[PDB]
Amino acid sequence: APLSSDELKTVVSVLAQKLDSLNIDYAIMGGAATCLLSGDPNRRTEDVDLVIHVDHRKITADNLTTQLLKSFPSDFEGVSQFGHTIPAYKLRRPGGTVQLVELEVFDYQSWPQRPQYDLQTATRTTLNINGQKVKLFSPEWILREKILSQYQRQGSRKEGTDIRDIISMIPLAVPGKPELNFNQSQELQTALANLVQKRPDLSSALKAKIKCSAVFHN
Ligand SMILES: [Mg+2]
Ligand SMILES: [Mg+2]
Ligand SMILES: [Mg+2]
């Protein structure tokens, strides 16, 4: 079930509380981030995707499952769909029953080919949900991911949502962040060329936020 905006906010505020209490640095990405930054309550998602920072304790994304189940047994339970146990938050509905919300957790050490997961350098932001600080990747970071995604998923059922997500993010971006400088990424240059070919009406709004000499000569 896609989570309502209210529900999503309950899930991430609790997760933020628990990660903070374990002193694990993190940032939320994916549909949750997009939804949290949306002005449209109809934009909804079904799980929470995040990156955590691994330090000397070696609480890797995989190892976090055990730590959550051990420290917060009231709030998390293990879910296994393909013989791999991951943590799910136990979202209580008003009538008292539990709706499981899966957590898709990543770390840089395990994905060296995704330097976007480096929490020490990625451009990031926070939201304050009724007093709780919730850590997210920034709109600039998200837009980079989405520009790539719309090209890689072109012709898929999700293409339209992606493009809608791009359009939502562009105005929240500011210029000058590394994630929106595409001069050293052939793959983002190509993805961007594909986007502005499809949606030339977005070209000036993107150009204001993105540095890419190949496409925008800026
Ligand atoms: Mg997701
Ligand atoms: Mg395990
Ligand atoms: Mg109920």
Side-chain angles (χ1 to χ4, degrees):
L3 298 172
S4 63
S5 174
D6 284 354
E7 285 170 344
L8 179 67
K9 287 168 187 173
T10 302
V11 179
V12 307
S13 56
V14 177
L15 181 58
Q17 181 196 67
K18 302 310 188 200
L19 299 178
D20 284 2
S21 86
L22 299 176
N23 290 294
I24 300 167
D25 192 27
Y26 74 95
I28 293 169
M29 65 184 166
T34 296
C35 291
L36 293 164
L37 296 166
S38 180
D40 184 353
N42 288 331
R43 188 60 176 93
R44 296 149 68 141
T45 201
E46 96 284 10
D47 68 12
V48 182
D49 310 85
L50 58 147
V51 172
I52 66 166
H53 179 69
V54 188
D55 67 15
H56 57 271
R57 291 171 294 170
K58 288 168 182 312
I59 307 171
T60 60
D62 194 34
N63 284 356
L64 185 60
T65 303
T66 303
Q67 191 58 50
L68 293 168
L69 291 181
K70 191 257 191 170
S71 292
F72 310 114
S74 295
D75 281 311
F76 300 93
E77 103 171 22
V79 171
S80 175
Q81 206 183 330
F82 299 103
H84 177 57
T85 296
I86 69 168
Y89 174 66
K90 291 195 283 173
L91 175 64
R92 307 262 174 170
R93 310 188 180 91
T97 70
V98 173
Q99 186 170 326
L100 295 173
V101 176
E102 296 181 350
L103 307 184
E104 300 215 4
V105 184
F106 299 78
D107 62 72
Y108 187 31
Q109 274 196 169
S110 319
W111 297 86
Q113 74 279 38
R114 293 183 182 175
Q116 63 271 38
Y117 294 174
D118 178 359
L119 293 170
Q120 187 184 353
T121 59
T123 300
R124 294 159 65 178
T125 200
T126 66
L127 298 181
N128 192 110
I129 309 301
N130 292 354
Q132 177 66 52
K133 196 181 67 183
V134 175
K135 298 177 185 176
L136 271 54
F137 288 103
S138 82
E140 300 85 17
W141 187 103
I142 291 155
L143 184 56
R144 178 194 184 91
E145 298 303 308
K146 297 279 173 191
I147 292 166
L148 186 55
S149 175
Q150 66 77 218
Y151 177 51
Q152 289 174 352
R153 299 190 192 213
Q154 177 168 302
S156 81
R157 235 296 172 142
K158 248 95 102 141
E159 186 182 357
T161 280
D162 243 274
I163 296 172
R164 167 274 162 210
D165 288 350
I166 289 172
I167 293 161
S168 176
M169 295 285 136
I170 294 159
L172 308 174
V174 314
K177 299 301 172 193
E179 290 88 354
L180 293 177
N181 177 323
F182 298 164
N183 287 336
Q184 291 234 57
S185 181
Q186 181 57 66
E187 85 186 325
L188 280 146
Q189 296 164 32
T190 300
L192 174 71
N194 165 266
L195 182 55
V196 309
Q197 183 289 325
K198 286 188 301 210
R199 293 295 301 261
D201 69 293
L202 300 186
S203 175
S204 53
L206 288 160
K207 177 170 180 179
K209 308 296 174 66
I210 297 169
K211 178 156 178 70
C212 180
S213 57
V215 172
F216 290 137
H217 305 297
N218 68 351

